[PDB]
Design an enzyme around this catalytic site. Structure first.
Site, PDB file in Angstrom:
ATOM      1  N   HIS B  47      -1.243   2.922  -1.132  1.00 34.98           N
ATOM      2  CA  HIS B  47      -1.148   2.454   0.027  1.00 34.98           C
ATOM      3  C   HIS B  47      -1.507   0.939   0.092  1.00 34.98           C
ATOM      4  O   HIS B  47      -0.481  -0.036   0.231  1.00 34.98           O
ATOM      5  CB  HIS B  47      -1.703   2.990   1.121  1.00 34.98           C
ATOM      6  CG  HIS B  47      -1.330   2.451   2.568  1.00 34.98           C
ATOM      7  ND1 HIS B  47      -2.427   1.801   3.526  1.00 34.98           N
ATOM      8  CD2 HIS B  47      -0.225   2.351   3.384  1.00 34.98           C
ATOM      9  CE1 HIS B  47      -1.612   1.138   4.541  1.00 34.98           C
ATOM     10  NE2 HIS B  47      -0.284   1.702   4.511  1.00 34.98           N
ATOM     11  N   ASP B  89       3.747   2.188   4.472  1.00 35.73           N
ATOM     12  CA  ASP B  89       3.035   3.150   5.326  1.00 35.73           C
ATOM     13  C   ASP B  89       3.471   4.447   5.554  1.00 35.73           C
ATOM     14  O   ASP B  89       2.778   5.800   5.824  1.00 35.73           O
ATOM     15  CB  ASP B  89       3.366   2.553   6.872  1.00 35.73           C
ATOM     16  CG  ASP B  89       2.669   1.338   7.201  1.00 35.73           C
ATOM     17  OD1 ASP B  89       2.224   0.470   6.598  1.00 35.73           O
ATOM     18  OD2 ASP B  89       2.436   1.043   8.441  1.00 35.73           O
TER      19      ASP B  89
END
Lengths: 121, 121
Positions: B47, B89
């Site tokens: 991420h 995300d």
């Protein structure tokens, strides 16, 4: 209960259960059954029939456990009443998500909706 | 922004992202990448590394639209940094949910999990 029901429909549809399904058509949210106005309504018709089947437990008031797993509604396995109650709710929320295609909010319920008699379960 | 990230993570894991992921491992919900402790941590590692690329936009603060269609986060299109952000995300939400089998509470950040330097993204 409708705590898990409500949560599942959100889980499946992303749409708030009370606001999108509280009084939708002849069957969603409202009491009893009618002839479906549309596929969404039909899901709830199929759900109330499914609850009708359930006699040893309280479909609306009894709580059960399910998991959100693999973005899937997995019923906590247990009482033939609860398991199948959960299954009835899993089924409804799937069905509801499967028919967002044709969710017509025009079916939300301003008082009476004019429903025909539910055909037999 | 994390509001979206949080919701995606919640909709993917159906787990509260602040409580579950807020301080987890070397990479989840903390500042910086570290050697990933376990898969969840690795998700957040990737991420962060996905964010590192989004310099035209602010990953933590910039809002993007996405939909929950067919129980799938669908990034809506906005900008390329914002669609990429949304994909980062969404990637993390999904990785998170795909690895909660191997979630360990020990990476509470009660530990502050003994973080080594992350190999370069």
């Amino acid at each position: 209960s409708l705590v898990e029901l409500g949560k599942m429909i959100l889980q499946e549809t992303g749409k708030n259960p009370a606001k999108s399904y509280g009084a939708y058509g002849c069957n969603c949210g409202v009491l009893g059954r009618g002839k479906p106005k549309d596929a969404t309504d039909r899901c709830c018709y199929v759900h109330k029939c499914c609850y009708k089947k359930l006699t040893n437990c309280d479909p609306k008031k009894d709580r059960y456990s399910y998991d959100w797993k693999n973005k899937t509604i997995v019923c906590g396995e247990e009482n033939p009443c609860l398991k199948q109650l959960c299954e009835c709710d899993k089924a409804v929320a799937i069905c509801l998500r499967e028919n967002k295609g044709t969710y017509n909010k025009k079916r939300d319920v301003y008082l009476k909706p004019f429903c025909d008699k539910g055909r037999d379960c």
